Amino acid sequence: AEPDLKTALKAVIPAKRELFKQVKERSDEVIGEVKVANVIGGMRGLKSMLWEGSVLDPEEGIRFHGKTIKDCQKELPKGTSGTEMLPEAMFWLLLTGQVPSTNQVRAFSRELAEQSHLPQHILDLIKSFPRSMHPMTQLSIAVAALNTESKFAKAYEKGLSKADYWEPTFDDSISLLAKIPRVAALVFRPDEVDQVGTQALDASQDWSYNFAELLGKGGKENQDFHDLLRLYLALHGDHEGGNVSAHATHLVGSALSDPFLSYSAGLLGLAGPLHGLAAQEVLRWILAMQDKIGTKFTDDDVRNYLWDTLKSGRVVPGYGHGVLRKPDPRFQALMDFAATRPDVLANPVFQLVKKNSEIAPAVLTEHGKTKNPHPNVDAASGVLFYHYGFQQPLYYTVTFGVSRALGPLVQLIWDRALGLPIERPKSINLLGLK
Amino acid sequence: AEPDLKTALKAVIPAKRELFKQVKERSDEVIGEVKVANVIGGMRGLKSMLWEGSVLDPEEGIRFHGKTIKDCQKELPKGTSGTEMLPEAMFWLLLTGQVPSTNQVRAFSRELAEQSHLPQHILDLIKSFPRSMHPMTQLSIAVAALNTESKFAKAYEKGLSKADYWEPTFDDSISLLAKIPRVAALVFRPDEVDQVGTQALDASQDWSYNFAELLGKGGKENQDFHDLLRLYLALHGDHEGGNVSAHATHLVGSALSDPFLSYSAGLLGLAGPLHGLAAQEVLRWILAMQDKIGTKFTDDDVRNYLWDTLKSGRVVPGYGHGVLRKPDPRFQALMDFAATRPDVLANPVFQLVKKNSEIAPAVLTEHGKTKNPHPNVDAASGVLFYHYGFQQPLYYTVTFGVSRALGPLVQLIWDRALGLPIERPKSINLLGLK
């Protein structure tokens, strides 16, 4: 009987609190400059928040406590079936700094499954949504409505010591994490709310598998989709604090709003076109290209389509977000998953994504307008979901929403464990900058 | 007719765009330093965001395009009846930089009343809320659900010029502003959704009056509450960008989420105990003090209570601003309103708030820990709502929610008009500060 997640976390809290004390003695130490560029540039490049679980390496890409995507694919536990790392395990790692054992992960998956259920009022609330309501709005709303179940909100109202803030924060995070796939499934399946809302989960089986089950893609016939979904959810869990969904969650949480409310704010940010639409834009762009170039096509047809796009003044979606000298290692992980699956490699839409990734970087480099010409994770994700029958791009941010619960909830727990204060920058008007 | 609000705004957009260009030539100018204190201190004192409508003067308090609270009380238009400045007028002033005429305000009030109506699905959504759901959660959720009516979300989806982002943003802001009092009234009155949801508003009357009407406090017998409600909503509209409800709105809005979604995020922040509970805390504290000091007390009984509170390690809620060297001029405005009304002066609980404001500052100064020991607006607001029959403090943040739509929506419109980019600071881990 090995330590469970809460216990593992308690063990590493004291070293973090100590590290925090050491850093705090250097409060007065100067680490950067603020320029006008930063004030009017949405704080671009201004190092001004704390985030523990992930740091972007300029050469290796995103890393979780120093572990690369490849380190995680090897070290982190897998499901009962399949080849891919579990998001639960990624969560463990983000929270504790440590790789759980398989045994530990199975026990955590079991708790997640035991807390998956929803109050009747949430299902009633979802049933009131019109068909036209955007799925991200549905997801944000239903997550915020679960604040009726917040142990943190109740304990704060009863009186709670600051040193105890993290415990009910942790309990609400696990609860949110357990319920969010079922909420997402209900957004996917508006006509099945009563049944999907109360469908009993296989408690032996993992978080992604049970999400797949609530989407109507369970069983052994879908074990490759399960592996995809595990991988996707793991890869998208956390990417530093500066992205809007993470920052919004931190910010709202810093006023001591519970995690249901805080992540709802994160999801309202993720609903924003400049933040959660990249995977859809890419799939749309690839489909259009396929339509134009035809199903059987030549390296030249692709290469010259790219030139036509760039000479029009359009961007090539899914390329060049990064600072890296190579592809986003999250992209590479998705292509490594593909390489083992012959039916995916036989899909002409995937073949076009792959061809494009061998050709577009050189085109973008010659063209010279983007700082970095390499693919990011959004270049491959949409297509892989498309291949398994998720052919309505509008819902792809929903899946992103499920994944992006992991990192921001971890940071909330830590924010509370350390006692980080309310987030309060200082504003200035344009007249004031002169 | 004189120019309507939209037109007045278009006239001042080019000068702001020009001013923005002048500031942008100075991008490279250095205006501050970033310390470790700032990274671990929720960005405290880091001047890093833009906010146009309000700037805090260290001597005069909050100012709106350079106008004090007293400048606004004198210059700004009033209702058909009453003595107090209208929030609609304050909105005009925040948006345009200019005092509207009375005629202009009446025309804007008429539009607000004509757009107050709600879709059937929002009333169905509100009916699904359980009695236990916190009122702020209800308000945040219902505001986000109105994104079904967003002109900005639809226009972005169809394709829209970046220089035209502000127009649909403006239209969604006015629409939100028009509907939010009716949404708030429904949170106050869950048993009357049928009537309060569809009740036609008097178009000749102002925004606060019609809010009062939807709360079940319309008519001539309530003309003083109307004036209170006007004053309160005006005073709380905007207080720089750094507060959580403002910052969250800006932040989520910078990813181009529409104003319904963006202000919903603002309201999830306002639902945080560290941001929207101050009026409640103060009222609870004054009532407890009243109970303790008894029927017959002196200045010393009160003075001793203050010492007991501070020696316990507790704060005196409603006292102590971060910069300002006098009472908050928003407090003074609320006490000036009281002084005119004999009914309010006959309230024992009001008399105790006033006594405390003549005594506590000297006590807090002697004690020496509270940085500036003067009352702020939270010292007086709760009691004045209590006097007019709002006797469940749980709902006081809802009223705050209505008011705080004004400033953040103005800033969104400007963010879009100037083309401000997505808000994206840079995070760092604790190990990284070493």
Side-chain angles (χ1 to χ4, degrees), chain B residues 204-228:
Chain B
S204 61
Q205 280 300 9
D206 66 309
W207 191 61
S208 311
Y209 177 101
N210 284 323
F211 184 22
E213 187 77 63
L214 290 157
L215 296 170
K217 290 188 86 68
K220 295 178 177 178
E221 64 288 9
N222 293 298
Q223 66 181 14
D224 291 302
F225 173 65
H226 303 158
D227 271 317
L228 173 73

mmCIF file of all heavy atoms in Angstrom, chain B residues 204-228:
data_model
loop_
_atom_site.group_PDB
_atom_site.id
_atom_site.type_symbol
_atom_site.label_atom_id
_atom_site.label_comp_id
_atom_site.label_asym_id
_atom_site.label_seq_id
_atom_site.Cartn_x
_atom_site.Cartn_y
_atom_site.Cartn_z
ATOM 1 N N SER B 204 -38.603 55.825 -20.543
ATOM 2 C CA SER B 204 -38.319 57.198 -20.078
ATOM 3 C C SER B 204 -37.439 57.250 -18.829
ATOM 4 O O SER B 204 -36.781 58.278 -18.559
ATOM 5 C CB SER B 204 -39.605 58.021 -19.834
ATOM 6 O OG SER B 204 -40.448 57.468 -18.831
ATOM 7 N N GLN B 205 -37.426 56.130 -18.079
ATOM 8 C CA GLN B 205 -36.676 56.079 -16.845
ATOM 9 C C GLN B 205 -35.254 55.590 -17.058
ATOM 10 O O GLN B 205 -34.966 54.922 -18.044
ATOM 11 C CB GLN B 205 -37.419 55.227 -15.788
ATOM 12 C CG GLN B 205 -38.552 55.955 -15.057
ATOM 13 C CD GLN B 205 -38.114 57.205 -14.278
ATOM 14 O OE1 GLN B 205 -36.976 57.694 -14.373
ATOM 15 N NE2 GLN B 205 -39.029 57.709 -13.482
ATOM 16 N N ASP B 206 -34.383 55.914 -16.103
ATOM 17 C CA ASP B 206 -32.972 55.548 -16.154
ATOM 18 C C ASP B 206 -32.658 54.075 -15.693
ATOM 19 O O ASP B 206 -33.513 53.355 -15.135
ATOM 20 C CB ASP B 206 -32.140 56.567 -15.368
ATOM 21 C CG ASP B 206 -32.439 56.540 -13.907
ATOM 22 O OD1 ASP B 206 -33.675 56.617 -13.581
ATOM 23 O OD2 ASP B 206 -31.464 56.458 -13.083
ATOM 24 N N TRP B 207 -31.416 53.670 -15.967
ATOM 25 C CA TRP B 207 -30.908 52.304 -15.795
ATOM 26 C C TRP B 207 -31.041 51.831 -14.358
ATOM 27 O O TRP B 207 -31.583 50.762 -14.112
ATOM 28 C CB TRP B 207 -29.444 52.295 -16.264
ATOM 29 C CG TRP B 207 -28.771 50.975 -16.435
ATOM 30 C CD1 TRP B 207 -29.128 49.960 -17.282
ATOM 31 C CD2 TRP B 207 -27.562 50.568 -15.794
ATOM 32 N NE1 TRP B 207 -28.224 48.915 -17.170
ATOM 33 C CE2 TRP B 207 -27.256 49.271 -16.263
ATOM 34 C CE3 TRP B 207 -26.716 51.170 -14.849
ATOM 35 C CZ2 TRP B 207 -26.140 48.569 -15.826
ATOM 36 C CZ3 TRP B 207 -25.599 50.466 -14.421
ATOM 37 C CH2 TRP B 207 -25.323 49.181 -14.905
ATOM 38 N N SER B 208 -30.566 52.636 -13.417
ATOM 39 C CA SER B 208 -30.740 52.350 -11.994
ATOM 40 C C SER B 208 -32.202 52.276 -11.546
ATOM 41 O O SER B 208 -32.572 51.387 -10.775
ATOM 42 C CB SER B 208 -30.049 53.424 -11.173
ATOM 43 O OG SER B 208 -28.704 53.614 -11.666
ATOM 44 N N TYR B 209 -33.026 53.214 -12.000
ATOM 45 C CA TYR B 209 -34.447 53.163 -11.653
ATOM 46 C C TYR B 209 -35.055 51.838 -12.105
ATOM 47 O O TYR B 209 -35.735 51.170 -11.335
ATOM 48 C CB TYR B 209 -35.249 54.346 -12.241
ATOM 49 C CG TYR B 209 -36.754 54.321 -11.970
ATOM 50 C CD1 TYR B 209 -37.316 55.122 -10.958
ATOM 51 C CD2 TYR B 209 -37.621 53.495 -12.712
ATOM 52 C CE1 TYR B 209 -38.672 55.095 -10.687
ATOM 53 C CE2 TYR B 209 -39.000 53.473 -12.450
ATOM 54 C CZ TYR B 209 -39.517 54.285 -11.437
ATOM 55 O OH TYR B 209 -40.859 54.281 -11.154
ATOM 56 N N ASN B 210 -34.814 51.458 -13.346
ATOM 57 C CA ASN B 210 -35.397 50.221 -13.856
ATOM 58 C C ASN B 210 -34.812 48.977 -13.175
ATOM 59 O O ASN B 210 -35.511 47.975 -13.041
ATOM 60 C CB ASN B 210 -35.248 50.125 -15.374
ATOM 61 C CG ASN B 210 -36.231 51.022 -16.117
ATOM 62 O OD1 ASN B 210 -37.385 51.200 -15.702
ATOM 63 N ND2 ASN B 210 -35.788 51.580 -17.237
ATOM 64 N N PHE B 211 -33.551 49.035 -12.747
ATOM 65 C CA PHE B 211 -32.992 47.960 -11.940
ATOM 66 C C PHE B 211 -33.782 47.869 -10.624
ATOM 67 O O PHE B 211 -34.305 46.800 -10.279
ATOM 68 C CB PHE B 211 -31.509 48.217 -11.689
ATOM 69 C CG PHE B 211 -30.781 47.118 -10.935
ATOM 70 C CD1 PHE B 211 -31.242 45.805 -10.876
ATOM 71 C CD2 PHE B 211 -29.574 47.419 -10.326
ATOM 72 C CE1 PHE B 211 -30.532 44.845 -10.184
ATOM 73 C CE2 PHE B 211 -28.848 46.464 -9.661
ATOM 74 C CZ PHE B 211 -29.327 45.174 -9.587
ATOM 75 N N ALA B 212 -33.913 49.001 -9.934
ATOM 76 C CA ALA B 212 -34.765 49.079 -8.731
ATOM 77 C C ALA B 212 -36.151 48.485 -8.965
ATOM 78 O O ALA B 212 -36.654 47.744 -8.126
ATOM 79 C CB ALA B 212 -34.877 50.509 -8.220
ATOM 80 N N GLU B 213 -36.732 48.770 -10.121
ATOM 81 C CA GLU B 213 -38.057 48.250 -10.474
ATOM 82 C C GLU B 213 -38.068 46.738 -10.602
ATOM 83 O O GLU B 213 -38.989 46.081 -10.148
ATOM 84 C CB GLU B 213 -38.564 48.894 -11.768
ATOM 85 C CG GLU B 213 -40.005 48.531 -12.134
ATOM 86 C CD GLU B 213 -41.053 49.281 -11.313
ATOM 87 O OE1 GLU B 213 -41.133 50.537 -11.406
ATOM 88 O OE2 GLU B 213 -41.813 48.598 -10.583
ATOM 89 N N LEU B 214 -37.036 46.170 -11.197
ATOM 90 C CA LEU B 214 -36.971 44.711 -11.337
ATOM 91 C C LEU B 214 -36.686 43.977 -9.999
ATOM 92 O O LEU B 214 -36.993 42.781 -9.855
ATOM 93 C CB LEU B 214 -35.929 44.365 -12.370
ATOM 94 C CG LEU B 214 -36.313 44.731 -13.798
ATOM 95 C CD1 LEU B 214 -35.062 44.881 -14.628
ATOM 96 C CD2 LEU B 214 -37.160 43.636 -14.397
ATOM 97 N N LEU B 215 -36.096 44.714 -9.046
ATOM 98 C CA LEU B 215 -35.909 44.250 -7.679
ATOM 99 C C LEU B 215 -37.145 44.366 -6.797
ATOM 100 O O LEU B 215 -37.119 43.892 -5.677
ATOM 101 C CB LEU B 215 -34.767 45.005 -7.007
ATOM 102 C CG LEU B 215 -33.405 44.767 -7.653
ATOM 103 C CD1 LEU B 215 -32.401 45.749 -7.066
ATOM 104 C CD2 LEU B 215 -32.929 43.345 -7.424
ATOM 105 N N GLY B 216 -38.222 44.967 -7.297
ATOM 106 C CA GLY B 216 -39.441 45.156 -6.523
ATOM 107 C C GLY B 216 -39.374 46.387 -5.655
ATOM 108 O O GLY B 216 -40.061 46.442 -4.636
ATOM 109 N N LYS B 217 -38.567 47.379 -6.063
ATOM 110 C CA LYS B 217 -38.468 48.675 -5.373
ATOM 111 C C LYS B 217 -38.578 49.876 -6.324
ATOM 112 O O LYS B 217 -37.799 50.830 -6.248
ATOM 113 C CB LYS B 217 -37.187 48.748 -4.545
ATOM 114 C CG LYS B 217 -37.200 47.833 -3.333
ATOM 115 C CD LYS B 217 -35.994 48.076 -2.433
ATOM 116 C CE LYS B 217 -36.203 49.204 -1.429
ATOM 117 N NZ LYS B 217 -37.214 48.876 -0.389
ATOM 118 N N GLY B 218 -39.567 49.825 -7.205
ATOM 119 C CA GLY B 218 -39.900 50.966 -8.054
ATOM 120 C C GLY B 218 -40.903 51.892 -7.385
ATOM 121 O O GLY B 218 -41.325 51.653 -6.244
ATOM 122 N N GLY B 219 -41.274 52.945 -8.110
ATOM 123 C CA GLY B 219 -42.230 53.948 -7.615
ATOM 124 C C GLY B 219 -41.621 55.055 -6.772
ATOM 125 O O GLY B 219 -40.472 54.992 -6.371
ATOM 126 N N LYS B 220 -42.435 56.064 -6.502
ATOM 127 C CA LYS B 220 -42.013 57.280 -5.803
ATOM 128 C C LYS B 220 -41.593 57.091 -4.346
ATOM 129 O O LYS B 220 -40.775 57.850 -3.838
ATOM 130 C CB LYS B 220 -43.146 58.287 -5.849
ATOM 131 C CG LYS B 220 -43.436 58.754 -7.260
ATOM 132 C CD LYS B 220 -44.596 59.721 -7.233
ATOM 133 C CE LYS B 220 -44.859 60.271 -8.625
ATOM 134 N NZ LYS B 220 -46.025 61.196 -8.617
ATOM 135 N N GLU B 221 -42.198 56.117 -3.673
ATOM 136 C CA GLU B 221 -41.852 55.819 -2.277
ATOM 137 C C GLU B 221 -40.397 55.379 -2.124
ATOM 138 O O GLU B 221 -39.854 55.468 -1.038
ATOM 139 C CB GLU B 221 -42.837 54.802 -1.637
ATOM 140 C CG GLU B 221 -42.924 53.368 -2.196
ATOM 141 C CD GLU B 221 -43.606 53.189 -3.576
ATOM 142 O OE1 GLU B 221 -43.903 54.183 -4.279
ATOM 143 O OE2 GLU B 221 -43.821 52.023 -3.982
ATOM 144 N N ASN B 222 -39.777 54.901 -3.207
ATOM 145 C CA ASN B 222 -38.381 54.453 -3.201
ATOM 146 C C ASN B 222 -37.390 55.410 -3.883
ATOM 147 O O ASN B 222 -36.313 54.980 -4.260
ATOM 148 C CB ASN B 222 -38.297 53.051 -3.831
ATOM 149 C CG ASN B 222 -38.993 51.991 -2.986
ATOM 150 O OD1 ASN B 222 -38.608 51.730 -1.831
ATOM 151 N ND2 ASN B 222 -40.023 51.372 -3.553
ATOM 152 N N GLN B 223 -37.712 56.700 -3.997
ATOM 153 C CA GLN B 223 -36.851 57.663 -4.745
ATOM 154 C C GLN B 223 -35.463 57.906 -4.139
ATOM 155 O O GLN B 223 -34.525 58.267 -4.848
ATOM 156 C CB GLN B 223 -37.563 59.017 -5.063
ATOM 157 C CG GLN B 223 -37.940 59.948 -3.894
ATOM 158 C CD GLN B 223 -38.663 61.244 -4.319
ATOM 159 O OE1 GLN B 223 -39.135 61.377 -5.461
ATOM 160 N NE2 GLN B 223 -38.799 62.193 -3.367
ATOM 161 N N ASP B 224 -35.328 57.681 -2.840
ATOM 162 C CA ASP B 224 -34.044 57.779 -2.166
ATOM 163 C C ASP B 224 -33.184 56.543 -2.451
ATOM 164 O O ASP B 224 -31.982 56.677 -2.674
ATOM 165 C CB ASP B 224 -34.251 57.976 -0.667
ATOM 166 C CG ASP B 224 -34.849 59.366 -0.322
ATOM 167 O OD1 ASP B 224 -34.253 60.422 -0.664
ATOM 168 O OD2 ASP B 224 -35.902 59.394 0.347
ATOM 169 N N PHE B 225 -33.787 55.357 -2.457
ATOM 170 C CA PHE B 225 -33.064 54.146 -2.846
ATOM 171 C C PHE B 225 -32.586 54.268 -4.294
ATOM 172 O O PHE B 225 -31.433 53.952 -4.600
ATOM 173 C CB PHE B 225 -33.889 52.874 -2.651
ATOM 174 C CG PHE B 225 -33.232 51.653 -3.207
ATOM 175 C CD1 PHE B 225 -32.047 51.190 -2.682
ATOM 176 C CD2 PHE B 225 -33.775 50.997 -4.286
ATOM 177 C CE1 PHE B 225 -31.422 50.076 -3.212
ATOM 178 C CE2 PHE B 225 -33.165 49.874 -4.821
ATOM 179 C CZ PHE B 225 -31.992 49.406 -4.275
ATOM 180 N N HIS B 226 -33.440 54.781 -5.166
ATOM 181 C CA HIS B 226 -33.023 55.037 -6.526
ATOM 182 C C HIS B 226 -31.756 55.883 -6.575
ATOM 183 O O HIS B 226 -30.804 55.527 -7.277
ATOM 184 C CB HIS B 226 -34.140 55.684 -7.319
ATOM 185 C CG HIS B 226 -35.401 54.882 -7.332
ATOM 186 N ND1 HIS B 226 -36.638 55.425 -7.595
ATOM 187 C CD2 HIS B 226 -35.611 53.571 -7.059
ATOM 188 C CE1 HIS B 226 -37.553 54.473 -7.511
ATOM 189 N NE2 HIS B 226 -36.958 53.340 -7.180
ATOM 190 N N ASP B 227 -31.733 56.977 -5.812
ATOM 191 C CA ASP B 227 -30.545 57.832 -5.761
ATOM 192 C C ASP B 227 -29.356 57.090 -5.174
ATOM 193 O O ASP B 227 -28.242 57.205 -5.678
ATOM 194 C CB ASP B 227 -30.787 59.147 -5.000
ATOM 195 C CG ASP B 227 -31.316 60.297 -5.902
ATOM 196 O OD1 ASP B 227 -30.821 60.495 -7.051
ATOM 197 O OD2 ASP B 227 -32.211 61.042 -5.423
ATOM 198 N N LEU B 228 -29.570 56.316 -4.120
ATOM 199 C CA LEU B 228 -28.473 55.490 -3.607
ATOM 200 C C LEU B 228 -27.882 54.559 -4.686
ATOM 201 O O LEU B 228 -26.663 54.435 -4.849
ATOM 202 C CB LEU B 228 -28.945 54.631 -2.442
ATOM 203 C CG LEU B 228 -27.857 53.632 -2.013
ATOM 204 C CD1 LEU B 228 -26.733 54.357 -1.272
ATOM 205 C CD2 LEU B 228 -28.435 52.477 -1.212
#
